[PDB]
Amino acid sequence: KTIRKIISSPLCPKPVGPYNQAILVNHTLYLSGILGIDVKTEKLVNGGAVAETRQALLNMGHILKEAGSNYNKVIKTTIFLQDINDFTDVNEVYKEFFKENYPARSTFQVGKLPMAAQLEIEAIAITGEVETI
Amino acid sequence: KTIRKIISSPLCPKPVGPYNQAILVNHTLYLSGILGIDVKTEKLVNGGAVAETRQALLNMGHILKEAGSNYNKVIKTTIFLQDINDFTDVNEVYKEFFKENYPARSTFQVGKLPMAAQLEIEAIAITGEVETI
Amino acid sequence: KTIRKIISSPLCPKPVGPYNQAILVNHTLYLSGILGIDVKTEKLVNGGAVAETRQALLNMGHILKEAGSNYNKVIKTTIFLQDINDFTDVNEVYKEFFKENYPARSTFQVGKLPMAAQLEIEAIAITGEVETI
Ligand SMILES: [Mg+2]
Ligand code: NA
Numbered sequence: 276k277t278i279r280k281i282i283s284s285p286l287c288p289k290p291v292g293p294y295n296q297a298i299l300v301n302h303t304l305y306l307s308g309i310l311g312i313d314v315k316t317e318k319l320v321n322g323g324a325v326a327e328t329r330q331a332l333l334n335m336g337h338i339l340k341e342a343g344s345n346y347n348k349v350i351k352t353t354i355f356l357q358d359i360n361d362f363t364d365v366n367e368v369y370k371e372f373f374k375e376n377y378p379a380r381s382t383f384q385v386g387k388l389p390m391a392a393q394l395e396i397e398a399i400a401i402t403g404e405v406e407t408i
Numbered sequence: 409k410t411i412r413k414i415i416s417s418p419l420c421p422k423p424v425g426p427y428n429q430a431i432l433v434n435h436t437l438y439l440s441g442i443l444g445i446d447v448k449t450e451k452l453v454n455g456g457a458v459a460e461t462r463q464a465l466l467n468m469g470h471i472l473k474e475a476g477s478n479y480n481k482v483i484k485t486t487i488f489l490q491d492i493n494d495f496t497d498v499n500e501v502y503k504e505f506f507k508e509n510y511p512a513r514s515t516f517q518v519g520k521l522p523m524a525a526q527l528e529i530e531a532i533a534i535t536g537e538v539e540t541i
Numbered sequence: 542k543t544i545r546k547i548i549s550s551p552l553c554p555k556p557v558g559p560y561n562q563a564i565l566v567n568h569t570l571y572l573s574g575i576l577g578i579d580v581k582t583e584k585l586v587n588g589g590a591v592a593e594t595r596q597a598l599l600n601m602g603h604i605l606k607e608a609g610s611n612y613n614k615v616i617k618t619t620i621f622l623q624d625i626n627d628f629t630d631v632n633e634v635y636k637e638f639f640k641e642n643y644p645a646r647s648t649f650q651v652g653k654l655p656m657a658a659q660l661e662i663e664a665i666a667i668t669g670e671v672e673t674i
Contacts, residue, residue, distance in 0.1 A: 276537040277435050279483075281509060293503045294513035298483050300436070300534060302543050303566070305484040308514030350545075350564045351571040353663075355516050359653040366558055373559045376547060380560035381574030381663045383621050384652035386517035387492040397486075397514045401566060404542040409670040410568050412616075414642060425632045426639055427646035431616045433569075433667060438617040441647035488649055519650035520625040530647045 277301060286337035288312040297338050304342045304400040308355065309334050310392045324361040324393040328368035331396050336372070344400040346372045351379040355395040359384040365394060376407055410434060419470035421445035430471050432535060437475045441488065441530040442467050443523055457494035457526040461501040464529050469505070477533040479505050484512040488528040492517040498527060509540055543567060550607040553600045554578045562604050565668060570608045572664040574621065575600050576656055590627040590659040594634040597662050602638070609668040612638050620648040621661040631660060642673050 282297035282304065283289065289296060290312070297306045311327030312334065313320050320330045332346075339345050354365060362382060378398070388395050415430035421443065423429060430439045444453050444460030445467070453463040465479075472478050487498060495515060511531070521528050548563035548570070549555070556562060563572045577586050577593030578600065586596040605611050620631060628648060644664070654661050 276539050277534050279509070279534065279538050279540045281540065292499055292513075293506050293510045295510050296512070298512045300483055305512045305532065307484075307512040308516075350566055351573075353514075355514075359655065362655065370559050376545065376564075377556070377559045377561050379562070379564045379571045379573040381619075381621075381661065383574075383654055383661065386519050386652050388516055389492060389495060395514065395516060399571065401543045401545065405545050406542050407545045407547065409672050410667045412642070412667065412671050412673045414673070423643075425628070425646070425648075426636045426643045427618075428643050429645070431645045433616055438645045438665065440617075440645040441649075486647075488647075519652050521649055522625065522628065528647070528649065 282338060282342045284337040284341040286314060287334040288314045288317060297342060299342050299402060302402050304344050304402055306335065306338055306398040306400065308395040308397040310390055310395055319390055319392055325364050325368055327393050328365045329371070331394065332368065332372045335396065335398060339400055343402040347375055348401045348405055349373070349378045349398050350401060351399045353397040354380065354382040355388060356382065356384045357388055357393045361393060415471060415475045417470040417474040419447060420467045421447050430475060432475050435535050437477050437533045437535055439468065439471055439531045439533065441528045443525045443528050452523055452525055458497050458501055460525060460527045461498045464527055465501065465505045468529065468531060472533055476535040480509055481538055482506065482511045482531050482533045484532045486530045487513065487515040488521060489515065489517045490521055490526045494526060548604060548608045550603040552580060552603040554580050554583055563608055565608050568668045570610050570666040570668055572601065572604055572666065574661040574663040576658045576661055585656055585658055591630050591634055593658060593660045594631045597660060598634065598638045601662065601664060605666055610666040613642060614667045614671050615639065615644045616665045616667060617645040619663045620646065621654060622648065622650045623654055623659045625650040627659065
């Protein structure tokens with residue numbers, strides 16, 4: 276049998292809808308795309324792409340920790356941008372969170388994001404013990 | 409070894425390029441993106457985003473059943489929209505299919521979809537027995 | 542324990558920033574999105590979508606082989622296009638590399654790609670022995 280666990284953290288925003296913040300399948304954690312929402316206001320943080328990146332990655336950490344993962348167990352990220360010219364600024368914030376054994380990554384500019392956001396970040400991570408060889 | 413199975417249903421629109429409808433690896437099913445095509449016509453259903461979402465999710469059910477999965481064993485979906493303003497409507501259709509243990513999800517507006525479609529959905533699901541906690 | 546391997550092929554452009562070419566988790570290989578970059582010039586190959594598809598898929602083969610995979614062990618690809626009207630030409634190049642047991646796939650047009658590329662291709666693959674039933 277496969278072990279599925281529904282992952283939720285009240286520290287990470289959860290706008291209404293038929294989705295879960297993350298789903299754990301054995302040791303592989305599939306995270307929903309994260310916007311830079313302030314959990315208190317339920318709105319995007321002010322300040323644009325830098326602030327939204329930072330907020331999204333802080334929010335992500337609550338989901339990773341709830342599942343028994345962490346930033347240094349993230350396998351792959353996808354960065355959806357409203358504007359490819361924000362990449363440099365987004366990547367500088369990304370380096371605040373990802374310091375070693377860096378994830379695989381894809382990045383592109385989309386047509387639009389929900390909530391008129393400047394980005395959205397999706398990730399896959401590993402839970403439990405990880406030997407990096 | 410890893411067991412791979414090619415998944416094919418004649419009830420889901422057949423591939424119009426060098427791809428399979430889905431690939432099963434052990435118990436993880438990787439679905440290709442699905443459009444709201446009626447296999448009886450080789451065309452999108454009429455009526456725009458709502459109709460197309462419903463037909464895409466019916467199509468998905470054929471693939472899931474062929475592989476030994478189902479909607480309640482879907483792990484992650486990605487919804488590609490031609491217009492972000494269809495999101496609420498697409499979500500209402502989505503809830504006709506996904507009732508519990510909801511998948512992780514990401515949603516965004518693309519530049520263009522194949523067939524000038526309004527909606528495309530890709531998914532990852534689990535086959536066989538699933539114990540949910 | 543989950544075994545993670547950091548994949549780095551010297552026959553492909555070395556990561557400049559906080560990402561890796563691919564991450565191997567047990568026998569599942571998560572590839573970064575690949576652009577059609579010439580490893581020597583660190584610039585896209587000239588000639589547009591056809592040339593960039595060929596170079597991207599040549600780069601993918603370097604990364605797959607470094608990890609112990611190959612094209613016939615790719616599970617799923619995603620093709621990010623600058624122009625959906627390139628699909629027919631991209632598919633003709635894709636068929637140079639993928640011959641049998643075709644991956645699942647999604648293809649769509651984005652707003653913009655890094656480096657003003659015409660194409661980016663991401664993949665998931667299997668390492669080690671694979672039995673196709
Ligand atoms: Mg701006
Ligand atoms: Na800014």
